[PDB]
Amino acid sequence: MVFHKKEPIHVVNIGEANPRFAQLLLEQFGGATGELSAALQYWVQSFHVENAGIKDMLQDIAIEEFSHLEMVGKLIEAHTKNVDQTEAYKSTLFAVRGMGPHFLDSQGNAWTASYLNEGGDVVRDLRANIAAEAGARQTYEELIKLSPDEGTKQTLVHLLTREISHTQMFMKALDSLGKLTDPFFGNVQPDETVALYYNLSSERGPWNSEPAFKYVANP
Amino acid sequence: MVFHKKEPIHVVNIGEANPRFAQLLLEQFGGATGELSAALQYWVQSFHVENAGIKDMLQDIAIEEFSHLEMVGKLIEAHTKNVDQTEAYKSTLFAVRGMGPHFLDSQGNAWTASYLNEGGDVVRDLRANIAAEAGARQTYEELIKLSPDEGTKQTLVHLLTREISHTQMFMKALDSLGKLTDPFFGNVQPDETVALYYNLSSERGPWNSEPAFKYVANP
Amino acid sequence: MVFHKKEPIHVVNIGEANPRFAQLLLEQFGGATGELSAALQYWVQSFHVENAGIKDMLQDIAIEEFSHLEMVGKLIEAHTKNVDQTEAYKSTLFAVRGMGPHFLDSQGNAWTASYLNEGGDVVRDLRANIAAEAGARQTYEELIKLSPDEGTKQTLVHLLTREISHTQMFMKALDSLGKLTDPFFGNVQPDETVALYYNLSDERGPWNSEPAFKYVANP
Amino acid sequence: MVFHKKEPIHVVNIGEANPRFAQLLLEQFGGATGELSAALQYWVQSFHVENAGIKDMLQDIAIEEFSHLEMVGKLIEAHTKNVDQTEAYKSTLFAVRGMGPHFLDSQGNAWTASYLNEGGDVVRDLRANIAAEAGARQTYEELIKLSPDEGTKQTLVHLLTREISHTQMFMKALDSLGKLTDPFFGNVQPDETVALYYNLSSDERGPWNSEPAFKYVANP
Amino acid sequence: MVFHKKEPIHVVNIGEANPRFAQLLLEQFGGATGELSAALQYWVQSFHVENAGIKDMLQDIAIEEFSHLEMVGKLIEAHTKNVDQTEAYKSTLFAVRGMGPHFLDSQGNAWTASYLNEGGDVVRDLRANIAAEAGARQTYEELIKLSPDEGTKQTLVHLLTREISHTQMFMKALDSLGKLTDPFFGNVQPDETVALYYNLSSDERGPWNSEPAFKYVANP
Amino acid sequence: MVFHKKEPIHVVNIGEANPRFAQLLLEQFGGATGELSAALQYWVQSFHVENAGIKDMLQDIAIEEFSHLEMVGKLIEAHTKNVDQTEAYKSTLFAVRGMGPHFLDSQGNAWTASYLNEGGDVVRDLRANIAAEAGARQTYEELIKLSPDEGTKQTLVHLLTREISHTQMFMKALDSLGKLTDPFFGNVQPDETVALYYNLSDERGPWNSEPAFKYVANP
Ligand SMILES: [Ca+2]
Ligand SMILES: [Ca+2]
Ligand SMILES: [Ca+2]
Ligand SMILES: [Ca+2]
Ligand SMILES: [Ca+2]
Ligand SMILES: [Ca+2]
Ligand SMILES: [Ca+2]
Ligand SMILES: [Ca+2]
Ligand SMILES: [Ca+2]
Ligand SMILES: [Ca+2]
Ligand SMILES: [Mn+2]
Ligand SMILES: [Mn+2]
Ligand SMILES: [Mn+2]
Ligand SMILES: [Mn+2]
Ligand SMILES: [Mn+2]
Ligand SMILES: [Mn+2]
Ligand SMILES: [Mn+2]
Ligand SMILES: [Mn+2]
Ligand SMILES: [Mn+2]
Ligand SMILES: [Mn+2]
Ligand SMILES: [Mn+2]
Ligand SMILES: [Mn+2]
């Protein structure tokens, strides 16, 4: 069962409303790398993850992501409230969709569950979550670069910081399985080609060198 | 510039056509975890990755994924050719869309670029690619469990094996950046909350224990 | 702030796992009339509804819908557990996506926020919510008719009951505004054609008769 | 069978072409709350509604919405006509998609039938139609606020007015069944929790969580 | 302005209801190659086509496609009528979405305007329409192969026949402009590579890569 | 088997980076009429086209379209490089998605395979391809009109030229089958209404006149 207390995870503090910025911020409300993606991805995984500890962790983090979604929603509300008459607002999708957050991204695309990567095996799920967190942190960085005021910026820095934290959580979980630095998982024995690297576009590195790989220079 | 030689990466060998299986196999042609997703994800990343070595690696692997896409296409062609009159075929989407592969998944959904995770920073891209590979390997495992004949199975095992190989390539690339086992990347200094773990759903593990985290048992 | 208790709102009791029914039940997990649609529609509205009482009501109901989502997910989990060798399971999308719920409908479509109807005016939102509850109730009735065992049916009858409850709540909120049975709302004065009915397609009712309307028999 | 007369229900009259506004107007052409949504929703319902009176009503209204769609199309055409040289036009999706209406919304999203709400019981359909009309009216109000000239505004006011009329029609149909203010419909009897209100977000009270209608559970 | 007569162009006659076939038939209702696609594509083009003859043709054909859509709808209704108890019906999307047509394809995908191809030059539009008709015909052929009874089949044969007629109409319109067999259109002159064929996949030859039309580059 | 040479088919030469134009150019990268649509449409057709000559032609052209896709991507890269402080860049989707191409259109829509028209009969495929080339040519013309500098324009004029070339190839293939100017194709005999024209909307042309048609003036 889910419950809600009405206070956000911390105070929403901003300067003058900047609705063009609010539109960019929709990325982290209803966009691919956003808070709904994170919350729903981790929560839906929890239904098929058999490891009780990792299942709990997924639920703990998912609930935090819902709190982040709320914070982002409150930021968008603050940056789109009471500025109907401004040229800035009239240039945004809020002018036709209404003020406040909506489950779409900065380009007006409806959130889709096609954004989610999950299923089958906890190792796939955790690797997917490390990727999700990387997209979330990246988008927060871009938004921070475009910050309209110091209060908005500090909130975004906090949210970004929490995705680094989550990344570390997922890495610890994967490492506990022995699968953070080992490529192999699942139940299928590989064939004899696992070490081959084909030079199909024609650079050397650890990804195509001894000891790990047999380099095929001219496939 | 791209080029094509008409022989596939190895011989397509199957038993009797199994078009219901061919429909499942569409996952790896036009589905989320499929070969187009992999090829396009890695290829589009190569345009914004500044590291010359990793850029080449992305292109090398992308071109292999296109060859995998071809192999999967040829498998679907073989399992849907010349069986128009069979009850099995009439129950599949091929009956109305035509024989052979199409860029949709096993449920008939059109492939969408919403399946892709990419942008901004090579560390995000590589983490996204490790996730993509995990989804691809997972789906191949499910398809192997449902294999209609030994020849089809061996091809799928080969493709699965190559995604383990790619996973290792991406892990080596990330490790060369120092970012396979370190959660932090990007250009934003975190705030003071990076070590906090909130017990919001109420299990202990390395993801919420000392030394790494300060456990908040009752947020 | 959101928080989570691990007990669902009641115990999942089913008979023999029925994975084909589990796929049908996805309608109420990731489908248009499902629990995610309800939760997200009412929650996102709460960010722009200024009446404190109605804002709170929307949040109270949204959190219940999240609990419903959990119940539905647990039913899908139960009906897809340890049956992956059965022909029934192999005929479902779970065979390639993995056991348990996914944010898709019964046809394999990814959930999309295009399913939501929200924005601008609390009267629009509440009418949208009465419509959403009607779709939810409808779908639960169809699932009840198709239910595989008594325990599953019982849970669905409860879920259906709560959507009748929610309908009444939304009606009471609308009536409190004088807008349950008054068609007019918003800030634009109607012109002189407001009470006209054009017979563009001879059936008669209070939707095209005095005292409500002037009937144009031949436009 | 369908037919078409080449005259719209009233001819367009606009000021200077405003292609940025034309893009906003796409919301009522190919958007969620737009005229195609209304027309297709009511028309597709007419196939499975057994009540002859309500079936006819749905078809009557669906045909009017198709005329509204044409009107909006003509407005968009007028506001993107002979202005392809202007910086305004170059800033809009018409610069790459061509002049005139397209079945997209103001954000360039393709119209999708995921916007429709229909199926099963006539009560579900009528309640969905009251909701669609509310959305349609709302969008027209925002477009009226943003409108470029008086002629365009007057047309949008007319279209908005007709959605208020349609709302009333759907309300009268529902009331004709006794289901306008009765929440219950369908063939499943509610269980014993039907009158409970759970205070899951916490203290605001109203008729939605107070007697006589509800038993309030203050601490679930 | 649009109008509607309640009689379809010919009334349905089917055998036993076949709801699995009804689901396949959704392809021509809410699918990519279906009647809504054809109707909306030709209608939306009519707003930006300046040639009066071709504009009228597009509207003429668009109205026929709307009648086709109605016919397909009625077929789907007939094939999902009074069979909700049957195992066949329970296996179809109608069991959860309700009887009758829905703006979905045979796979349960919502119709999307991404299925449309339109904009800019009349030649682009007419070539898109020849392609849409080819897709429409193709899907009807597959449905005819799969058809459940003679009455249903005969209707689908008729609909297919009309798409052949429409193809001819679009071809005659294009030919009327001299652009049926002339690849060039628009206002940009081709550069010097216009006649080159690159053998990028390798040796098959045909009129598409041989003189007189092309200079063949055997090893790019 | 696919392989890749790193030289694009010609050198990217632009003037000052113009990120707003780069966003427009996305139409031909991830948009409906773009290069990915062309490449994937012709390639996927090649799996079910049995005429060896036409199969090969489809593959020859598809590989060229992939080279075009690369050219377009390199143009977008060039026009979004090292300008992220400019107000122009900050107004584009690149500001939150990262520099360089993405598989989206100029409106931020994810590419979808719903853009493709393919299946069943080589005549359907070739007609679909003539239509795709027309859309591609149209979009290139609009971009040329909007081009930011001479070098960019030059590349676009070349790309446009090749779509005229491709159109001619598809016409020659169709004509080789006798189906460029013959409306009829497929395996179903037409009924007796095939030469009728209904005047459902008084303009006349060879599309509703003898010798081709019998004109029904009043249906
Ligand atoms: Ca957009
Ligand atoms: Ca979109
Ligand atoms: Ca290389
Ligand atoms: Ca499906
Ligand atoms: Ca779909
Ligand atoms: Ca916990
Ligand atoms: Ca009437
Ligand atoms: Ca409360
Ligand atoms: Ca060749
Ligand atoms: Ca005419
Ligand atoms: Mn977060
Ligand atoms: Mn996170
Ligand atoms: Mn692969
Ligand atoms: Mn791979
Ligand atoms: Mn519910
Ligand atoms: Mn509810
Ligand atoms: Mn209307
Ligand atoms: Mn209306
Ligand atoms: Mn038709
Ligand atoms: Mn046609
Ligand atoms: Mn091209
Ligand atoms: Mn081309």
TrEMBL record, chains C, F:
Mn(2+) 1 binds at residues 35, 65, 68, 163. Mn(2+) 2 binds at residues 65, 133, 163, 166. Coiled coil: none annotated. Ca(2+) 3 binds at residue 109. Ca(2+) 1 binds at residues 56, 60, 199, 201. Keywords: Calcium, Metal-binding. Ca(2+) 2 binds at residue 107. Signal peptide: none annotated. The keyword Phosphoprotein does not apply. This is Alr3090 protein. It comes from Nostoc sp. (strain PCC 7120 / SAG 25.82 / UTEX 2576).
